[PDB]
Design a protein around this ligand. Structure first.
Ligand SMILES: C=CC1=C(C)/C(=C/c2[nH]c(/C=C3N=C(/C=C4\NC(=O)C(C)=C4C=C)C(C)=C\3CCC(=O)O)c(CCC(=O)O)c2C)NC1=O
Length: 242
């Protein structure tokens, strides 16, 4: 989580850099252990007939978080990506923190962050609703509508093209606030009942299945590694169904 050894970090979009730092800072003092990705994946790079894709994977776990995944990626010189999901241990019934940032030479094109539900009612737990409302509605000038598979995201989901530096910083601060709420609720959460654990597990499986419908992610992977590799990466590395 010291991103000091990262090859990609110094060359990434500035908003991406600040988000990577914020997420690493949030995780740094947790009771972390490594989480071994399939084939103990770390750094990976590939090219077929076009641009090369490079990805740095970092992945941890704690008793409350089954898998805490931070990816940084670059396609050629034209495209920077940050991806993060904290997959909850269903026993504690926490939502899914997720973030995806895509940037090119012109700036950030997509900034997405959410605390996504795992309950069957598609609602966040009550304490998250209370804490999230207290943050107030952020104003962003260029909102983007989620694609249909995006039904998985909560009403607090951000999906924007930041308009300027003030918006970039506003977005990063909102992600820090979501992380602050989430890490706090993780301390105050109890082991749930076996039926409740099952209901949360089902929500998390649904979230992964829907995230696999994201053809924007899939095409980037396919252009660098091919269809089979991208299928294995999406289903086994990014959005593994437990
Ligand atoms: C290797 C990893 C990886 C790649 C290659 C990737 C690519 C990627 N994801 C994108 C969109 C997106 N990405 C997401 C959301 C997420 N995606 C997530 O992995 C998570 C956790 C969420 C939400 C928390 C959404 C909702 C879109 C918009 C898709 C659309 O417009 O159809 C886009 C389009 C950006 C734009 O329209 O401006 C690209 C190129 N994203 C990645 O993470």
């Amino acid at each position: 989580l010291s991103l000091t050894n990262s090859s990609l970090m110094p060359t990434l979009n500035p908003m991406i850099q600040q988000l990577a730092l914020a997420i690493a800072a949030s995780w740094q003092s947790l009771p972390l252990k490594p989480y071994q990705l399939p084939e103990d994946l770390g750094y990976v790079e590939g090219r077929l007939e076009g641009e090369k894709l490079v990805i740095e994977n970092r992945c941890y776990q704690t008793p409350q978080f089954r898998k805490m995944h931070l990816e940084l990626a670059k396609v050629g010189k034209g495209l920077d990506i940050l991806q993060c999901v904290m997959f909850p241990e269903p026993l504690y019934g926490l939502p899914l923190f997720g973030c995806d940032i895509v940037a090119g030479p012109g700036g950030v094109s997509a900034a997405i962050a959410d605390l996504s539900p795992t309950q069957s009612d598609r609602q966040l737990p009550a304490a998250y609703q209370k804490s999230l409302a207290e943050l107030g509605q952020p104003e962003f000038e260029q909102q983007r509508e989620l694609p249909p598979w995006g039904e998985i995201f909560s009403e607090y989901c951000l999906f924007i093209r930041p308009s300027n530096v003030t918006e970039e910083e506003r977005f990063v601060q909102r992600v820090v606030d979501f992380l602050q709420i989430h890490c706090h609720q993780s301390i105050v959460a109890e082991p749930l009942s076996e039926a409740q654990t099952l209901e949360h597990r089902q929500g998390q499986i649904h979230y992964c299945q829907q995230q696999q419908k994201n053809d924007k992610t899939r095409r980037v992977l396919e252009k660098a590694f091919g269809e089979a590799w991208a299928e294995r990466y999406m289903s086994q590395v990014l959005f593994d169904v437990i």
